[PDB]
């Protein structure tokens, strides 16, 4: 029974299974479990539910539950528990109605001691995938409710999962202890200590001094130069994942110079992503040329990349009326200079390093990118108002992409909707997104996703940049390195020391 030291930039949170920030998804994933399980091969399999049947119309799903599960406090996991959980989520729809499964779900019914029926307004093909997510459909013991729910807080974070939160010291650490009565396989580590360490350089120093045993994260747990250093050094186990969600810039089709398709195409041709990846990222993320990568369901449709071609960029601009005067000037149209704001939350280190590169590259073709690294509330306001020319965004990874991310494009207060608002075919895109989510036919789903994604690509709504990757670094004694099936999943339970 070894112990593991991990680190994270913030405390894990109160670990409410049905709330969002400040609860950390990786930690929710350690404690609470779903009815069905997303696998790395894209399939969804049994988990708390052993099997399930679907009505002829696809509107009702009856889930047969395992009869050998208990919450970490000894309380029985059963159909009434699953109902009480779903009900408190459905009593709080405004927090959850970003998730289309919630919108479709009507009721949960107990139809046997270990059998739960879920009823929907319509057949909804992402049902099983969205039931597998970190939240909100995972299960706390109902004895832990307050006011008959979880929206106003919980007594203690009691789940059925392989780890229990046993100690929290604010600003210092969160300690997870192995659930010794877990229903599934027994984890080889008895304890994970998550040390709260906010700065990535501080994290590397702590790692080299033997105070942290494993680095693992998708948002730069250490700097790219440090990852490079570690790997060359050749004493550690180091690995990068396959491509996860895509980092993009969204270009505003409804606002500023990006209203012009020719400007958006020029932008996509003038940024040297290969150099950006080689210099600032040291090869730790793969170039992305489309909104979704080839490994996303329905997304491998053979779209043609916008090649790095700065001369072509120049030409398109010229024929849009954006012309220069002397060599090295900012282009002008109708006595209006080609100035474009690029927005990102100012504490986001990776985004900042990328923004600076985008600025330099576009400057070579006559575009004055004005960098705006702002405070979070200021950025949020811009997103809803559509008050941006270019703004950083990213997809959601597995198993959210593409269904849940395209679904969010429909919401007026979102950056993706605001950026797409100037497209002549915006209404048709949104109507097709709705149709694809409730389609019961695979041929139709392929055609629909192909059309939606082709329009977004051919209209140059996005500047795709890179594929996010989980980076992992570990002393060899920790053992083999495995990546979670989901972006947010850190499989501590699969680590086997030595
Ligand atoms: O974070 C939220 O409150 C809701 N999420 C919903 C989609 N999420 C999953 C989640 O938060 O449960 C994507 C993500 O955070 O990775 C929206 C977002 O990140 O834009
Ligand atoms: Fe989220």
Q: Descriptors for this entry?
A:
SBP_5, binds fe (iii) ion, 2 domains, Dipeptide-binding Protein, domain 3, Peptide/Ni-bd, 29% helix, peptide transmembrane transporter activity, nickel cation binding, alpha+beta, binds the ligand O=C(O)CN(CCN(CC(=O)O)CC(=O)O)CC(=O)O, D-Maltodextrin-Binding Protein, domain 2, six-stranded mixed beta sheet, 498 residues, four-stranded mixed beta sheet
Mind sketching the topology for me?
Blueprint: E1 3-8, H1 25-31, E2 36-38, E3 44-46, E4 49-54, E5 60-65, H2 79-90, H3 93-96, H4 100-104, E6 105-112, E7 115-120, H5 127-130, E8 163-169, E9 173-178, E10 191-196, H6 200-208, E11 214-217, H7 224-233, E12 237-240, E13 246-251, H8 261-270, H9 273-279, E14 286-287, H10 310-318, E15 339-345, H11 349-363, E16 368-374, H12 376-385, E17 390-394, H13 403-408, H14 415-420, H15 426-438, H16 442-458, E18 462-467, E19 471-474
Parallel strand pairs: 1-10, 15-16, 15-17
Antiparallel strand pairs: 2-3, 4-5, 5-7, 6-7, 8-9, 9-10, 11-19, 12-19, 13-17, 13-18, 14-18
Bound molecules: ligand EDT and fe (iii) ion (FE).
Task: Give a verbal description of the structure.
Belongs to the bacterial solute-binding protein 5 family. This protein is of the alpha+beta class and 498 residues long. The longest helix is centred in the last third of the chain and has 17 residues, at 442-458. 45% of the residues are buried. Strand 4 (49-54) and strand 5 (60-65) form a beta hairpin. The chain has helices at residues 25-31, 79-90, 93-96, 100-104, 127-130, 200-208, 224-233, 261-270, 273-279, 310-318, 349-363, 376-385, 403-408, 415-420, 426-438, 442-458, and strands spanning 3-8, 36-38, 44-46, 49-54, 60-65, 105-112, 115-120, 163-169, 173-178, 191-196, 214-217, 237-240, 246-251, 286-287, 339-345, 368-374, 390-394, 462-467, 471-474. It contains 16 helices and 19 strands. The two termini are 12 Å apart. Helix 8 (261-270) runs antiparallel to helix 10 and helix 15 packs antiparallel against helix 16 (442-458). The chain has 2 domains: 1-241 and 470-498, 3-Layer(aba) Sandwich (D-Maltodextrin-Binding Protein, domain 2), CATH 3.40.190.10; 242-469, Dipeptide-binding Protein, Domain 3 (Dipeptide-binding Protein, domain 3), CATH 3.10.105.10. Bound molecules: ligand EDT and fe (iii) ion.
